[PDB]
């Protein structure tokens, strides 16, 4: 089945870390449209920026938004109507650059979670990918 992974990583208190969102076993027929939402505790990390990954061929297809007060980041993909760009291979969809709190302590674990209510994947306008598996990730605080 298509497998979505939020990468885990580590960093120091006060640092920016980079959390990749990966797609494996992407259908060769293509993903036409998707949304993906991650939650996090904004006392632990906040979003500095979100960067499209190499699976995005044209920026007009990809849209992001994040709300640090409410602890979420969202991304959408909409292939053009002729499917001239389509996600039909495996790789990095996007990366979220998170600022780790200045007050983080060594050994804390901040879970970066997939929100299944706001995440969905489609082969076409009417045909949903209904067996996608979400895998979440963790930011570990390490010592300077």
């Amino acid at each position: 089945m298509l497998q979505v992974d939020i990468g885990s990583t580590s960093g120091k208190a006060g640092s920016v870390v980079s959390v990749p969102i990966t797609f494996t076993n992407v259908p060769k027929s293509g993903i036409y449209a998707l949304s993906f939402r991650t939650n996090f505790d904004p006392q632990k990390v906040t979003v500095a920026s979100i960067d499209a990954g190499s699976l995005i061929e044209n920026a007009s297809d990809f849209t992001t938004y994040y709300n640090n007060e409410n602890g979420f980041a969202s991304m959408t993909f909409e292939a053009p109507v002729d499917r001239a760009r389509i996600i039909d291979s495996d790789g990095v969809f996007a990366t979220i650059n998170f600022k780790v709190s200045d007050s983080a302590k060594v050994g804390e674990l901040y879970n970066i979670t997939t929100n299944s209510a706001y995440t969905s994947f489609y082969y076409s306008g009417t045909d949903e990918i209904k067996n996608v598996v979400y895998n979440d990730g963790k930011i570990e605080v390490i010592a300077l």
Partner: protein, 73 residues
């Protein structure tokens, strides 16, 4: 009464209606600027607003489809 796809209630199904559905999925908005926007947004008729309702509205504005699945097609 409402027109399917016409999420801002202005009487026409336009490219901005698809933008507004994508803004709802992204979390930029929590509601549509129209009394019947949530109903008008659900153009596949599955009962929920999802990213494919936005792409369906876009594809209808672009002339790829001529009616919405909720319209029985």
């Amino acid at each position: 009464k409402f027109i399917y796809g016409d999420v801002d209630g202005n009487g026409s199904v336009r490219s901005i209606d698809a933008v507004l559905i994508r803004d709802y999925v992204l979390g930029k908005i929590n509601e549509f600027p129209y009394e019947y926007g949530m109903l008008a947004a659900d153009v596949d008729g599955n009962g929920s607003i999802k990213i494919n309702d936005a792409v369906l509205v876009r594809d209808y504005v672009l002339g790829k489809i001529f009616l919405f699945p909720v319209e029985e097609k």
